[PDB]
Symmetry: C2
Protein backbone atom coordinates (compact mmCIF):
# COMPACT_ATOMS: atom_id res chain seq x y z
CA UNK A 1 0.00 0.00 0.00
CA UNK A 2 3.08 2.31 0.02
CA UNK A 3 4.20 4.26 -3.04
CA UNK A 4 7.82 4.41 -1.75
CA UNK A 5 9.50 2.83 1.29
CA UNK A 6 9.45 6.16 3.18
CA UNK A 7 5.64 5.93 3.16
CA UNK A 8 5.96 2.63 5.11
CA UNK A 9 8.20 4.43 7.64
CA UNK A 10 5.67 7.18 8.22
CA UNK A 11 2.81 4.66 8.48
CA UNK A 12 4.51 2.43 11.07
CA UNK A 13 5.65 5.38 13.22
CA UNK A 14 1.99 6.57 13.28
CA UNK A 15 0.68 3.09 14.05
CA UNK A 16 3.08 2.70 16.97
CA UNK A 17 2.23 6.20 18.30
CA UNK A 18 -1.49 5.36 18.33
CA UNK A 19 -1.38 1.89 19.44
CA UNK A 20 0.82 3.21 22.28
CA UNK A 21 -1.55 5.96 23.45
CA UNK A 22 -4.30 3.34 23.64
CA UNK A 23 -2.14 1.10 25.89
CA UNK A 24 -0.58 3.82 28.11
CA UNK A 25 -3.84 5.69 28.74
CA UNK A 26 -4.93 2.69 30.88
CA UNK A 27 -1.91 2.95 33.26
CA UNK A 28 -3.78 5.07 35.87
CA UNK A 29 -6.69 2.58 35.88
CA UNK A 30 -4.37 -0.42 36.29
CA UNK A 31 -2.62 1.40 39.19
CA UNK A 32 -5.92 2.37 40.87
CA UNK A 33 -5.28 6.12 40.47
CA UNK A 34 -8.30 6.44 38.12
CA UNK A 35 -11.61 4.54 38.53
CA UNK A 36 -12.21 1.18 36.82
CA UNK A 37 -15.21 1.26 34.45
CA UNK A 38 -15.37 -2.19 32.82
CA UNK A 39 -17.30 -1.00 29.75
CA UNK A 40 -14.86 1.89 29.18
CA UNK A 41 -11.87 -0.42 29.28
CA UNK A 42 -13.55 -3.11 27.13
CA UNK A 43 -14.20 -0.50 24.40
CA UNK A 44 -10.64 0.88 24.61
CA UNK A 45 -9.07 -2.58 24.43
CA UNK A 46 -11.17 -3.29 21.25
CA UNK A 47 -9.53 -0.21 19.67
CA UNK A 48 -6.09 -1.38 20.90
CA UNK A 49 -6.76 -4.87 19.44
CA UNK A 50 -7.25 -3.33 15.97
CA UNK A 51 -4.26 -0.99 16.24
CA UNK A 52 -1.95 -3.71 17.58
CA UNK A 53 -2.21 -5.66 14.27
CA UNK A 54 -1.18 -2.71 12.07
CA UNK A 55 2.53 -1.82 12.42
CA UNK A 56 4.00 -5.14 11.43
CA UNK A 57 3.23 -5.34 7.67
CA UNK A 58 4.95 -1.91 7.31
CA UNK A 59 8.17 -3.48 8.77
CA UNK A 60 8.02 -6.29 6.17
CA UNK A 61 9.99 -7.05 3.00
CA UNK A 62 11.38 -4.00 1.21
CA UNK A 63 10.55 -1.50 4.01
CA UNK A 64 14.21 -1.03 5.09
CA UNK A 65 14.89 2.51 6.31
CA UNK A 66 13.91 4.89 9.05
CA UNK A 67 15.50 5.00 12.50
CA UNK A 68 14.92 1.40 13.64
CA UNK A 69 17.74 -1.10 14.04
CA UNK A 70 18.51 -3.07 10.85
CA UNK A 71 18.01 -6.51 12.42
CA UNK A 72 14.25 -6.06 11.75
CA UNK A 73 15.10 -7.03 8.16
CA UNK A 74 18.41 -8.92 8.51
CA UNK A 75 16.86 -11.17 11.21
CA UNK A 76 13.22 -11.05 10.03
CA UNK A 77 12.37 -14.42 11.65
CA UNK A 78 13.40 -13.11 15.08
CA UNK A 79 11.36 -9.87 14.77
CA UNK A 80 8.32 -12.06 13.87
CA UNK A 81 8.88 -14.14 17.02
CA UNK A 82 8.71 -10.93 19.26
CA UNK A 83 5.64 -9.90 17.26
CA UNK A 84 3.84 -13.36 17.82
CA UNK A 85 4.54 -12.99 21.50
CA UNK A 86 3.06 -9.49 21.59
CA UNK A 87 -0.03 -10.37 19.58
CA UNK A 88 -0.68 -13.40 21.84
CA UNK A 89 -0.41 -11.18 24.95
CA UNK A 90 -2.97 -8.81 23.33
CA UNK A 91 -5.44 -11.73 23.05
CA UNK A 92 -5.04 -12.31 26.81
CA UNK A 93 -5.68 -8.59 27.47
CA UNK A 94 -8.85 -8.71 25.34
CA UNK A 95 -10.05 -11.68 27.40
CA UNK A 96 -9.40 -9.82 30.68
CA UNK A 97 -11.18 -6.68 29.43
CA UNK A 98 -14.15 -8.69 28.17
CA UNK A 99 -14.41 -10.45 31.60
CA UNK A 100 -14.63 -7.10 33.37
CA UNK A 101 -12.31 -7.95 36.30
CA UNK A 102 -9.63 -5.54 37.42
CA UNK A 103 -7.34 -8.28 38.79
CA UNK A 104 -7.20 -10.02 35.39
CA UNK A 105 -6.75 -6.65 33.66
CA UNK A 106 -3.74 -5.84 35.85
CA UNK A 107 -2.09 -9.20 35.10
CA UNK A 108 -2.68 -9.07 31.31
CA UNK A 109 -1.63 -5.40 31.11
CA UNK A 110 1.71 -6.39 32.74
CA UNK A 111 2.09 -9.26 30.25
CA UNK A 112 1.55 -6.92 27.28
CA UNK A 113 3.86 -4.22 28.68
CA UNK A 114 6.74 -6.67 29.10
CA UNK A 115 6.34 -7.73 25.45
CA UNK A 116 6.35 -4.07 24.33
CA UNK A 117 9.62 -3.56 26.20
CA UNK A 118 11.23 -6.69 24.77
CA UNK A 119 10.86 -5.72 21.19
CA UNK A 120 11.95 -2.13 21.83
CA UNK A 121 15.15 -3.27 23.67
CA UNK A 122 16.14 -5.40 20.66
CA UNK A 123 15.00 -3.40 17.64
CA UNK A 124 14.80 0.43 18.45
CA UNK A 125 17.91 2.71 18.08
CA UNK A 126 20.09 3.43 21.10
CA UNK B 1 -5.44 10.77 27.69
CA UNK B 2 -2.78 13.43 26.86
CA UNK B 3 -0.24 14.65 29.41
CA UNK B 4 0.16 17.99 27.55
CA UNK B 5 -1.64 19.46 24.53
CA UNK B 6 1.31 18.64 22.23
CA UNK B 7 0.59 14.95 22.88
CA UNK B 8 -2.90 15.50 21.38
CA UNK B 9 -1.25 17.07 18.31
CA UNK B 10 1.02 14.10 17.76
CA UNK B 11 -1.86 11.65 18.31
CA UNK B 12 -4.24 13.30 15.81
CA UNK B 13 -1.54 13.66 13.13
CA UNK B 14 -0.86 9.90 13.48
CA UNK B 15 -4.56 9.03 13.42
CA UNK B 16 -5.09 11.04 10.24
CA UNK B 17 -1.99 9.49 8.59
CA UNK B 18 -3.29 5.97 9.27
CA UNK B 19 -6.86 6.46 8.64
CA UNK B 20 -5.73 8.02 5.34
CA UNK B 21 -3.53 5.12 4.19
CA UNK B 22 -6.49 2.80 4.80
CA UNK B 23 -8.75 4.95 2.56
CA UNK B 24 -6.24 5.76 -0.23
CA UNK B 25 -4.93 2.19 -0.58
CA UNK B 26 -8.35 1.29 -2.09
CA UNK B 27 -8.08 3.87 -4.93
CA UNK B 28 -6.66 1.36 -7.48
CA UNK B 29 -9.48 -1.11 -6.68
CA UNK B 30 -12.18 1.56 -7.04
CA UNK B 31 -10.64 2.61 -10.40
CA UNK B 32 -10.38 -1.00 -11.65
CA UNK B 33 -6.57 -0.90 -11.88
CA UNK B 34 -6.27 -3.57 -9.14
CA UNK B 35 -8.62 -6.58 -8.76
CA UNK B 36 -11.72 -6.42 -6.53
CA UNK B 37 -11.65 -9.05 -3.75
CA UNK B 38 -14.79 -8.46 -1.66
CA UNK B 39 -13.39 -10.10 1.49
CA UNK B 40 -10.15 -8.08 1.26
CA UNK B 41 -12.04 -4.81 1.00
CA UNK B 42 -14.55 -5.75 3.75
CA UNK B 43 -11.64 -6.41 6.16
CA UNK B 44 -9.87 -3.16 5.20
CA UNK B 45 -13.02 -1.08 5.60
CA UNK B 46 -13.49 -2.58 9.14
CA UNK B 47 -10.00 -1.23 10.00
CA UNK B 48 -10.90 2.15 8.41
CA UNK B 49 -14.17 2.22 10.43
CA UNK B 50 -12.17 1.98 13.69
CA UNK B 51 -9.54 4.52 12.63
CA UNK B 52 -12.12 7.01 11.33
CA UNK B 53 -13.53 7.50 14.86
CA UNK B 54 -10.16 8.37 16.45
CA UNK B 55 -8.86 11.82 15.40
CA UNK B 56 -11.77 13.90 16.59
CA UNK B 57 -11.47 13.69 20.41
CA UNK B 58 -7.83 14.90 20.02
CA UNK B 59 -9.18 18.09 18.30
CA UNK B 60 -11.54 18.73 21.25
CA UNK B 61 -11.52 21.21 24.14
CA UNK B 62 -8.07 22.35 25.25
CA UNK B 63 -6.18 20.78 22.30
CA UNK B 64 -5.41 24.13 20.60
CA UNK B 65 -2.05 24.09 18.81
CA UNK B 66 -0.29 22.40 15.96
CA UNK B 67 -0.52 23.46 12.32
CA UNK B 68 -4.30 23.29 11.79
CA UNK B 69 -6.44 26.36 11.30
CA UNK B 70 -7.77 27.86 14.56
CA UNK B 71 -11.45 27.68 13.58
CA UNK B 72 -11.39 24.02 14.77
CA UNK B 73 -11.66 25.50 18.28
CA UNK B 74 -13.13 28.97 17.68
CA UNK B 75 -15.97 27.43 15.59
CA UNK B 76 -16.13 24.01 17.30
CA UNK B 77 -19.80 23.47 16.32
CA UNK B 78 -18.93 23.81 12.62
CA UNK B 79 -15.97 21.36 12.80
CA UNK B 80 -18.37 18.84 14.47
CA UNK B 81 -20.83 19.27 11.59
CA UNK B 82 -18.07 18.31 8.98
CA UNK B 83 -17.14 15.43 11.28
CA UNK B 84 -20.84 14.10 11.49
CA UNK B 85 -20.98 14.23 7.74
CA UNK B 86 -17.76 12.24 7.40
CA UNK B 87 -18.70 9.63 9.98
CA UNK B 88 -22.11 9.14 8.28
CA UNK B 89 -20.39 8.64 4.90
CA UNK B 90 -18.15 6.00 6.57
CA UNK B 91 -21.28 4.06 7.64
CA UNK B 92 -22.40 4.02 3.97
CA UNK B 93 -18.95 2.74 2.91
CA UNK B 94 -19.14 -0.05 5.52
CA UNK B 95 -22.53 -1.06 4.10
CA UNK B 96 -21.14 -1.16 0.54
CA UNK B 97 -18.11 -3.21 1.61
CA UNK B 98 -20.25 -5.63 3.59
CA UNK B 99 -22.56 -6.09 0.52
CA UNK B 100 -19.58 -7.06 -1.64
CA UNK B 101 -20.59 -5.07 -4.75
CA UNK B 102 -18.05 -2.96 -6.60
CA UNK B 103 -20.66 -0.49 -7.92
CA UNK B 104 -21.80 0.38 -4.39
CA UNK B 105 -18.17 0.55 -3.23
CA UNK B 106 -17.34 3.07 -5.97
CA UNK B 107 -20.29 5.30 -5.03
CA UNK B 108 -19.64 5.22 -1.25
CA UNK B 109 -15.88 5.72 -1.72
CA UNK B 110 -16.67 8.92 -3.71
CA UNK B 111 -19.04 10.06 -0.94
CA UNK B 112 -16.34 9.59 1.73
CA UNK B 113 -13.63 11.24 -0.38
CA UNK B 114 -15.71 14.38 -0.91
CA UNK B 115 -16.23 14.65 2.87
CA UNK B 116 -12.46 14.26 3.45
CA UNK B 117 -11.83 17.12 1.04
CA UNK B 118 -14.46 19.37 2.61
CA UNK B 119 -12.99 19.35 6.03
CA UNK B 120 -9.44 19.78 4.74
CA UNK B 121 -10.43 22.84 2.59
CA UNK B 122 -11.92 24.55 5.67
CA UNK B 123 -9.62 23.55 8.53
CA UNK B 124 -6.03 22.65 7.24
CA UNK B 125 -3.34 25.40 6.80
CA UNK B 126 -2.83 27.01 3.40
C1 LIG C 1 8.32 -5.48 18.16
C2 LIG C 1 7.55 -6.67 17.54
C3 LIG C 1 7.51 -4.35 18.75
C4 LIG C 1 6.50 -4.46 19.59
C5 LIG C 1 5.85 -5.74 20.16
C6 LIG C 1 6.25 -3.14 20.12
N1 LIG C 1 7.06 -2.22 19.50
FE1 LIG C 1 7.20 -0.26 19.90
N2 LIG C 1 8.60 -0.06 18.45
C7 LIG C 1 9.16 -1.08 17.71
C8 LIG C 1 10.18 -0.57 16.86
C9 LIG C 1 11.07 -1.40 15.92
C10 LIG C 1 10.22 0.89 17.09
C11 LIG C 1 11.17 1.89 16.43
C12 LIG C 1 10.44 2.74 15.42
C13 LIG C 1 11.18 4.00 15.12
O1 LIG C 1 10.49 5.06 15.02
O2 LIG C 1 12.44 3.97 14.96
C14 LIG C 1 9.19 1.14 18.05
C15 LIG C 1 8.86 2.38 18.50
C16 LIG C 1 7.84 2.70 19.34
C17 LIG C 1 7.37 4.03 19.65
C18 LIG C 1 7.90 5.32 19.01
C19 LIG C 1 7.28 5.52 17.64
C20 LIG C 1 7.66 6.85 17.06
O3 LIG C 1 6.91 7.28 16.15
O4 LIG C 1 8.67 7.51 17.49
C21 LIG C 1 6.38 3.91 20.54
C22 LIG C 1 5.53 5.04 21.17
C23 LIG C 1 6.23 2.50 20.81
N3 LIG C 1 7.14 1.77 20.07
C24 LIG C 1 5.36 1.95 21.73
C25 LIG C 1 5.05 0.61 21.85
C26 LIG C 1 4.04 0.06 22.73
C27 LIG C 1 3.25 0.86 23.79
C28 LIG C 1 4.05 -1.27 22.56
C29 LIG C 1 3.18 -2.33 23.25
C30 LIG C 1 1.73 -1.88 23.53
C31 LIG C 1 4.99 -1.57 21.50
N4 LIG C 1 5.61 -0.41 21.13
C32 LIG C 1 5.28 -2.83 21.03
C33 LIG C 1 8.83 -2.39 17.82
C34 LIG C 1 7.86 -2.94 18.65
C1 LIG D 1 -12.60 17.25 9.37
C2 LIG D 1 -13.77 16.77 10.26
C3 LIG D 1 -11.70 16.20 8.76
C4 LIG D 1 -12.07 15.11 8.11
C5 LIG D 1 -13.50 14.60 7.84
C6 LIG D 1 -10.90 14.60 7.46
N1 LIG D 1 -9.79 15.33 7.81
FE1 LIG D 1 -7.92 15.12 7.12
N2 LIG D 1 -7.32 16.66 8.30
C7 LIG D 1 -8.12 17.47 9.07
C8 LIG D 1 -7.36 18.51 9.67
C9 LIG D 1 -7.90 19.62 10.56
C10 LIG D 1 -5.95 18.29 9.24
C11 LIG D 1 -4.75 19.16 9.59
C12 LIG D 1 -3.86 18.45 10.58
C13 LIG D 1 -2.47 19.03 10.58
O1 LIG D 1 -1.51 18.20 10.64
O2 LIG D 1 -2.32 20.28 10.54
C14 LIG D 1 -6.00 17.11 8.43
C15 LIG D 1 -4.89 16.54 7.87
C16 LIG D 1 -4.85 15.37 7.16
C17 LIG D 1 -3.66 14.66 6.75
C18 LIG D 1 -2.23 15.08 7.12
C19 LIG D 1 -1.89 14.63 8.52
C20 LIG D 1 -0.45 14.88 8.85
O3 LIG D 1 0.02 14.20 9.80
O4 LIG D 1 0.25 15.71 8.18
C21 LIG D 1 -4.04 13.60 6.05
C22 LIG D 1 -3.15 12.50 5.42
C23 LIG D 1 -5.49 13.63 6.01
N3 LIG D 1 -5.97 14.73 6.69
C24 LIG D 1 -6.29 12.73 5.32
C25 LIG D 1 -7.66 12.62 5.44
C26 LIG D 1 -8.47 11.59 4.82
C27 LIG D 1 -7.95 10.54 3.80
C28 LIG D 1 -9.74 11.82 5.17
C29 LIG D 1 -11.00 11.04 4.77
C30 LIG D 1 -10.79 9.51 4.67
C31 LIG D 1 -9.75 12.94 6.09
N4 LIG D 1 -8.47 13.42 6.20
C32 LIG D 1 -10.87 13.47 6.68
C33 LIG D 1 -9.47 17.32 9.19
C34 LIG D 1 -10.26 16.35 8.61
Amino acid sequence: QFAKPEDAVKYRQSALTLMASHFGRMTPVVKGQAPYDAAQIKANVEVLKTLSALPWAAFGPGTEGGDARPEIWSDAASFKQKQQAFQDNIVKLSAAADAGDLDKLRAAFGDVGASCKACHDAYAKK
